[PDB]
A = this chain, B = another copy of it.
Amino acid sequence: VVIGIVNNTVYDPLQPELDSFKE
């Protein structure tokens, strides 16, 4: 819908912190 959007990635602080420990 937005003119000029770009691809990138957004960091998720929760996922590594709570997947390394929960493993």
A residues adjacent to B (C-beta < 8 A)? 14, 18-19, 21-22
Contacts and interface: CB of A to CB of B under 8 A. Distances in A.
Q: In the assembly, how many copies of this chain are there?
A: 2
7 contacts: A14-B14, A14-B18, A18-B18, A18-B22, A19-B21, A21-B22, A22-B22
Nearest to A13: B14
A2 to B, nearest CB: 24
A21 to B, nearest CB: 6
Contacts of A18: 14, 18, 22
Contacts of A14: 14, 18
Contacts of A22: 18, 21-22
